[PDB]
Amino acid sequence: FEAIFGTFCNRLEWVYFLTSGLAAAAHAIKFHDLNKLTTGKMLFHVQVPRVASGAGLPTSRQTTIMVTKYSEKSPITIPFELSAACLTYLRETFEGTILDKILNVEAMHTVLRALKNTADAMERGLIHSFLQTLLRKAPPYFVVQTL
């Protein structure tokens, strides 16, 4: 005889955005009207101090500096596929035979694996998008040290 000693399956590791240390740079918020939002903004108002000047020299008038900051938008996406045979087995039972039961349970397990995989992919894609944002805004060492 020839023997099958075992059949193996990889156990996945699930990651979440909040569990990462990269989330420390984030202030994460849910907003159920986000699709209806045109980009949001923040307003700032600063009045600088000044020093009294000596005789003869011109004085400094008092300035107000008002600035604005804006937001960026960047959605993400991922698909999962199900076959028509998987769908028809998932929906309906033909006969009560053991094989048909196997096919029904197998379609259910196919769908469950696909949903779990997509959910993990969504968490990972959020992490990836935030890291890309950080790399997009971050200037290199020589610029910031010169500043």
């Binding site: 005889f1 020839e2 023997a3 099958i4 075992g6 059949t7 053991i98 039961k101 397990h109």
Partner: protein
């Protein structure tokens, strides 16, 4: 000082393994466990044969 296994293990064949070796020249180890998990609808076995 290290704790090591004192004896070789024992790989044994179930009677369904015997029937399948006779009829098909093949072995599926833990054949009855595979059967029970397959019929109950459980997607994972507990451990390797």
């Amino acid at each position: 000082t290290v704790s090591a296994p004192a004896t070789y293990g024992n790989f044994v064949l179930s009677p369904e393994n015997a029937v399948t070796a006779i009829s098909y020249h093949s072995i599926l180890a833990d054949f009855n466990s595979y059967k029970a998990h397959l019929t109950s609808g459980q997607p994972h076995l507990p451990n390797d044969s």
